[PDB]
């Protein structure tokens, strides 16, 4: 026969070389006598080069291989919300079959030059530092980057946890569905990340595509595209998702494994030439689509893991030059106790201004200014300083303190803008630096009881009246006096 079927010539190291299968398409999924699946990546004169999805102990020389006539696809659609799948769309959580609105290929063209609009709606993360200083827009691609154990996942997870504000509501255009792509993580970690969103009732609007430490490299290579196509479902259907890739470092490592084994030629650090093209394809798929396209959107939070802080490292270079900016983490800031451990000086969002709750952007155009000058007079923290550069150190410490934020407790916008107001306009300079802790708690609960109306206007109008500015001012001066 040999047009629909083949014979394994040899097998090892997750790769099997197969004779025939002559009608096979590049990247066609195939199936082996034993039942393990694999995909065909190299189509060579005499043989096909298939990568395995399972242990190659299952495969032997001479075995029969069957075409499935199928480019890797995945079930997509909302029947997936609250589910934990592997990279092929399979259910890994004991909850029965996925109800798929349809199927999409793992590989898909990015929305072109034409069917996009400029990013203009906020992704509100709840994190004071991020929302105020590194504003993320819908459709944007903000990159989370830092060394191991700095807090990268925490930033993403708080974005996810903060969507209850809208996802529990009615208004579609205002909800945001979460997609967490776990790559080469300890299953017990994933398990616990699940057990964490369910503890915050976030699962109901999240999807976990799981490609854990121990699974075949192809699955780890595929998972992000697989999940990409899951996101686009929402994008294409006038809705909004956001997608967290945790992490791209490990995806690149996976791609590497496949290539080297297929004996594709290596470059810098033994990555194939098209490792860039790998990640460009992925992240270019994220966008804000134009009115004609249902105006849906897909936002991207790729995670990238530096090594001893090396942004020049091969992979971080590629990815940094694809994204619209970075949220930058540092263990130094972390052990100082500044959590989130966001390096402000190094974090940018190329989208920026355009994506900020106008109200937060109103009381914070000054914030990047102050914290800039505070970074420059910082070493003066060691006896005879003039009142100007004394003052600069007075704001900075308080301001930095104000942007610490315990985990899992993201703040509502109408809850951020008061604190950032009292800060920037100098109502904390009087207060000591240790009390800035209890300040926030007591201010907000007081504002809730005695000024719930101003808070309501911010939450509703999204902007600040000349009156609202005197309202807040008065309510602050009252609380600061008290």
């Amino acid at each position: 026969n040999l047009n629909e079927t083949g014979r394994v010539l040899a097998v090892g190291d997750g790769i099997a070389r197969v004779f025939g299968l002559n009608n096979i398409q590049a990247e066609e999924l195939v199936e082996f006598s034993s039942g393990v699946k694999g995909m065909a990546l190299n189509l060579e004169p005499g043989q096909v080069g298939i990568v395995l999805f399972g242990s190659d102990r299952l495969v032997k020389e001479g075995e029969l291989v069957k075409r499935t006539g199928n480019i890797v696809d995945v079930p997509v659609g909302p029947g997936l919300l609250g589910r934990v799948v592997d990279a092929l769309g399979n259910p890994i959580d004991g909850k029965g079959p996925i109800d798929a609105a349809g199927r999409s290929r793992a590989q898909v063209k990015a929305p072109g030059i034409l069917p996009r609009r400029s990013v203009h709606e906020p992704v509100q993360t709840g994190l004071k530092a991020v929302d105020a200083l590194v504003p993320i827009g819908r459709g944007q691609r903000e990159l989370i980057i830092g060394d191991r154990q700095t807090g990268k996942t925490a930033v993403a997870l708080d974005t996810i946890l903060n969507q209850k504000r809208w996802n529990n509501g009615s208004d579609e255009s205002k909800k945001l569905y979460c997609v967490y792509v776990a790559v080469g993580q300890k299953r017990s970690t994933v398990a616990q990340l699940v057990q964490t969103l369910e503890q915050h009732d976030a699962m109901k609007y999240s999807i976990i595509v799981a490609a854990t430490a121990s699974e075949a490299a192809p699955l780890q290579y595929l998972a992000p595209f697989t999940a990409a196509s899951i996101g686009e479902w929402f994008r294409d259907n006038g809705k909004h998702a956001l997608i967290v890739y945790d992490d791209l470092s490990k995806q690149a490592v996976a791609y590497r494994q496949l290539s080297l084994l297929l004996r594709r030629p290596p470059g810098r650090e033994a990555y194939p030439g098209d490792v860039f093209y790998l990640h460009s394809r992925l992240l270019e798929r994220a966008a804000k689509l134009s009115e004609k396209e249902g105006s849906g959107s897909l936002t991207a939070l790729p995670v990238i893991e530096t090594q001893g802080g090396d942004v020049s490292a091969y992979i971080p270079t590629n990815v940094i030059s694809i994204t619209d900016g970075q949220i930058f983490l540092e263990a130094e800031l972390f052990y100082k106790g500044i959590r989130p451990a966001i390096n402000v000086g190094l974090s940018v969002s190329r989208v920026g201004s355009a994506a900020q709750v106008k109200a937060l952007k109103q009381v914070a155009g000054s914030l990047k200014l102050f914290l800039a000058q505070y970074r420059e007079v910082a070493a003066f923290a060691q006896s005879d300083l003039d009142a100007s550069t004394k003052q600069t150190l007075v704001r900075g410490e308080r301001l930095t303190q104000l942007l610490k934020q315990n985990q899992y407790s993201p703040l509502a916008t109408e809850e951020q803008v008061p604190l950032i107001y009292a800060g920037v306009n100098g109502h904390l300079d009087g207060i000591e630096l240790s009390r800035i802790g209890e300040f926030e708690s007591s201010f907000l609960s007081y504002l809730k009881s005695n000024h719930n109306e101003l808070l309501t206007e911010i939450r509703e109008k999204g902007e600040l009246s000349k009156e609202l500015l005197a309202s807040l001012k008065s309510a602050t001066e009252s609380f600061v006096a008290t």
């Binding site: 394994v8 010539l9 040899a10 097998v11 090892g12 190291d13 997750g14 070389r17 242990s55 190659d56 102990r57 299952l58 032997k60 020389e61 001479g62 934990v84 890994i92 959580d93 004991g94 191991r148 154990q149 080469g184 993580q185 300890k186 299953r187 017990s188 970690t189 994933v190 398990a191 616990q192 057990q195 799981a210 854990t212 430490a213 121990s214 699974e215 075949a216 490299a217 780890q220 490990k250 490592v253 996976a254 590497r256 494994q257 080297l260 084994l261 290596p266 650090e269 033994a270 090594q307 001893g308 090396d310 263990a331 130094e332 052990y335 100082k336 106790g337 923290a381 060691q382 006896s383």
Partner: protein, 470 residues
């Protein structure tokens, strides 16, 4: 008897190619045997090269092998004896005894390669395992059921540390324990076996609480590359079938990756970066993910991790981090100060340090201790250049307190008496937190630096303070 025969067709170092009759090949990961003048020689099928030929890896030395020599298919992966019969015994990579106490009389053997538990078999618990070691229990506390790595470049105190753990944990532990020696010093192993007997943990004429699995660096890559799974399987069996608590000690898990490294090219794989094998990530994944608490029972593992060239960003250790619940980072800089254990108080982390698990006070003390030392670290520029003179008064005190704290984090291990001549002191977790709390609020600012160094609890700080002032 229905035996399958092949013949050796090549030997290149640790790689032995074997040829079999028509489509009748043993599958990948199967064991083969060659009956040699002294004992047998186990092989492990690695690839199917084609034309009825397989590439194997040798669980021993390949010298003396003759091409065309009969090979025998065992029909399945390398087997180990399992269960309570391995208690008090020493085992080599191929489930054979090396204690010369006769054959390991168990009812079951088990393949050393096995699948890692499904996502749905996982068990998350934030339970805390008290070590007795001040810095761990304060700053990066080890999790029962957890995985726990000990990172360290050569000779910063990993093996000593891990033995201090065994000294403490492995008594108070009701269940069983496996120790795996993966490519370490035959003599270290020697000590352990003689300590186990004298700690009582082993008893060659009665009940024993621990199994010993050895594959030291005196042994060829294939062997050094599988003996982890040999050990790990014995653990697995107590986890899943004795339905109970295990403690899995691996020293040193980096040699599993290294051994993988040493044959990679001979199996014909292009090198990846820093000349590590292309399969580093997934190979480590494929092992580490079996070492795991599940619904049937709990493992708790302590793995020493060699950090090559003291470089933490070396592909090998850098990969291992993702696998552990708690990371204890030993540092040369620390150890060079005479501060044992060489734990880096800032770079050490454990998921359990969260108020929800240890209480707020514990978390606050632990955070402040960290802030203290972080400041003291930040100021070491201004101390060098402009002395201690040119400092804010709060700072002068922060430094005073940081130095006192650095020392209170050291502690005489029992195991390391040969080095300090100082008796081993063990500290209770509540005593740790209380004393650091006290130190932190200044209720000890008068006592000299030396009084905190190489002592147990705050009792010992006072005791020493006076004994020296005398």
């Amino acid at each position: 008897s229905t035996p399958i025969t092949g013949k050796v067709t090549a030997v290149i170092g640790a790689i032995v190619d074997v040829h079999f009759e028509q489509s009748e090949l043993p599958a990948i990961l199967n064991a083969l045997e060659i009956k040699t003048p002294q004992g047998k020689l186990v092989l492990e099928v690695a690839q199917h090269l084609g034309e009825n030929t397989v590439r194997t890896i040798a669980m021993d030395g390949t010298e003396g092998l003759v091409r065309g020599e009969k090979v025998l298919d065992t029909g399945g992966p390398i087997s180990v004896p399992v269960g309570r019969e391995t208690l008090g015994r020493i085992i080599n990579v191929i489930g054979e005894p090396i204690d010369e106490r006769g054959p390991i009389k168990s009812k079951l053997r088990k393949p050393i390669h096995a699948d890692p538990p499904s996502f749905a078999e996982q068990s998350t618990s934030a339970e805390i395992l008290e070590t007795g070691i001040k810095v761990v229990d304060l700053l990066a506390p080890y999790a029962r059921g957890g995985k726990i790595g000990l990172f360290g470049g050569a000779g910063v105190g990993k093996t000593v540390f891990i033995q201090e753990l065994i000294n403490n944990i492995a008594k108070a532990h009701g269940g069983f324990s496996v120790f795996t020696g993966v490519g370490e010093r035959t003599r270290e192993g020697n000590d352990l076996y003689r300590e186990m007997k004298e700690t009582g943990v082993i008893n060659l004429e009665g009940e024993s609480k621990v199994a010993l699995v050895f594959g030291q660096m005196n042994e060829p890559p294939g062997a050094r590359a599988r003996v982890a799974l040999t050990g790990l399987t014995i653990a697995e069996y107590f986890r899943d079938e004795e339905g109970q608590d295990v403690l899995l000690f691996i020293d040193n898990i980096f040699r599993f990756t290294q051994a993988g490294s040493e044959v990679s090219a001979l199996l014909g794989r292009i090198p990846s970066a820093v000349g590590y094998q292309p399969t580093l990530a997934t190979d480590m994944g494929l092992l580490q993910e079996r070492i795991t608490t599940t619904k049937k029972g709990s493992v708790t593992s302590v793995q020493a991790v060699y950090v090559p060239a003291d470089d933490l960003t070396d592909p090998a250790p850098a990969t291992t981090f993702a696998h552990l619940d708690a990371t204890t980072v030993l540092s040369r800089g620390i150890s060079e100060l005479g501060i044992y254990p060489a734990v880096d108080p800032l770079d050490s982390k454990s998921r359990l340090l969260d108020a929800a698990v240890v209480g707020q006070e514990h978390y606050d003390v632990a955070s402040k201790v960290q802030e203290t030392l972080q400041t003291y670290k930040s100021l070491q520029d201004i101390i060098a250049i402009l002395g201690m003179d040119e400092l804010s008064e709060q700072d002068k005190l922060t430094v005073e307190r940081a130095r006192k704290i650095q020392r209170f984090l050291s502690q005489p291990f029992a195991v390391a008496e040969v080095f300090t001549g100082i008796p081993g002191k063990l500290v209770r977790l509540k005593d740790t937190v209380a004393s650091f709390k006290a130190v932190l609020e200044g209720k000890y600012d008068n006592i000299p630096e030396h009084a905190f160094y190489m002592v147990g609890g705050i009792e010992d700080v006072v005791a020493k303070a006076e004994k020296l002032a005398a």
